């Protein structure tokens, strides 16, 4: 009932994760538990992936509208 709810949340969540990752001391950087010392090459790939995931969540939100 209302598939717009998961897509809505995911669009906001990805938009904010993309925004917060511009601050390199954000708590959003703590979620990669499986990496020991977050180096700067991790951060460059993480920001690309987050941008890619935001554009996907944008797509699936538009699709549910």
Partner 1 sequence: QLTEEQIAEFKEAFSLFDKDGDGTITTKELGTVMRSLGQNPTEAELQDMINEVDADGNGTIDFPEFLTMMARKMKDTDSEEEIREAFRVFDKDGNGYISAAELRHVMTNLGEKLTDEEVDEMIREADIDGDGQVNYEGFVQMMT
Using CB under 8 A, list all residues that contact partner 1. Answer: 2, 4-20, 26-28, 30-35, 41-42, 44-49, 51-56, 58-59, 61-62, 65
CB of 4 to partner 1, least distance (A): 5
Q: Which CB, 19 or 24, lies closer to partner 1?
A: 19
Query: What are the C-alpha distances in Å from 57 to residues 6, 18, 26, 51, 60?
Result: 10, 12, 22, 10, 5
CB of 45 to partner 1, least distance (A): 5
CB of 37 to partner 1, least distance (A): 13
In the block, which residue shows the tokens 């995911």? Answer: 10
In the chain, the DSSP E strands lie at none
Find the largest Cα–Cα distance for the chain. Answer: 43
């Amino acid at each position: 009932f209302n598939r717009q709810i998961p897509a809505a949340a995911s669009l906001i969540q990805t938009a904010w994760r993309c925004y917060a990752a511009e601050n390199p001391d954000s708590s959003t950087w703590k979620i990669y538990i499986r990496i020991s010392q977050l180096r700067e090459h991790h951060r460059a790939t993480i920001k690309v992936i987050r941008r890619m995931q935001y554009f996907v969540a944008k797509k699936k939100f538009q699709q549910a509208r």
